[PDB]
Every structure is written in structure tokens, then in C-alpha cells.
């Protein structure tokens, strides 16, 4: 399944995922492509912040869905 991840600056990347993938899995994939550590990532879909432990299917994220990625600094 192909999805998109987009930032506030308009950068868009593509990921290959499965419905059963967790949000934590997706953050790992973004880190592989773009080097952003999962701790600093927050994903949003349909105006809601997503939870690491839940799955893409939980949020009805499908082929060609776009997730919004934003930073949240830990320190
Ligand atoms: Ca690029
Ligand atoms: Cl990927
Ligand atoms: Cl940001």
C-alpha cells in the first residue's frame, strides 16, 4: 500500500506500508528515508494526532492517503 507524508513546508515523500502497520512502524520508515528520529515525529490524519501503538487500518488510512508530519522536540 502506498501512502504520502507531507510537511508544513510542502515536502512530500512516499512510503510503502500495510494496513496492519502501526504508527510506530511508519515513523521508522520515515526515519529510514529522511533521518528524522521517531521521538521527534508527530503524525496527523483527518485532523487527529495518531498514536504509536495503533494501526493504519484503525484510522482508515488507505492507498494514496496523505499523513501530515510535524516536529515535537523532546528536550
Ligand atoms: Ca524528495
Ligand atoms: Cl517505505
Ligand atoms: Cl514541523
What would you note in describing this structure?
The protein has 75 residues and is of the alpha+beta class. It has one domain (1-75). It is 16% helix and 31% strand. The protein contains 1 helix and 5 strands; from the N terminus they run E-E-H-E-E-E. The chain has one helix at 23-34; strands at residues 2-6, 12-16, 41-45, 48-49, 66-71. A 5-stranded mixed β-sheet has the order 2-1-5-3-4, with helices on one face. The longest helix has 12 residues, at 23-34. The chain is globular and about 30 Å long. One chloride ion (CL) is lined by residues 15-16, 29. There is a cross-link at residues 6, 11, 27, 29, 33, 48, 63 (Glycyl lysine isopeptide (Lys-Gly) (interchain with G-Cter in ubiquitin)). This is Ubiquitin. The record marks 68 as: Essential for function. The modification (Microbial infection) ADP-ribosylthreonine is found at residue 66.
Structural class: alpha+beta
Query: What small ligands are held by the chains?
Result: calcium ion, chloride ion
Strand order of the largest sheet: 2-1-5-3-4
Distance N to C terminus: 34 Å
Topology, number of strands: 5
Overall shape: it is globular
Site (Interacts with activating enzyme): 54, 72
Cross-link (Glycyl lysine isopeptide (Lys-Gly) (interchain with G-Cter in ubiquitin)): 6, 11, 27, 29, 33, 48, 63
Protein name: Ubiquitin
Modified residues ((Microbial infection) ADP-ribosylthreonine): 66
Provide a concise account of the structure shown.
By secondary structure, this protein is an alpha+beta fold. The protein has one helix at 23-34, and strands spanning 2-6, 12-16, 41-45, 48-49, 66-71.
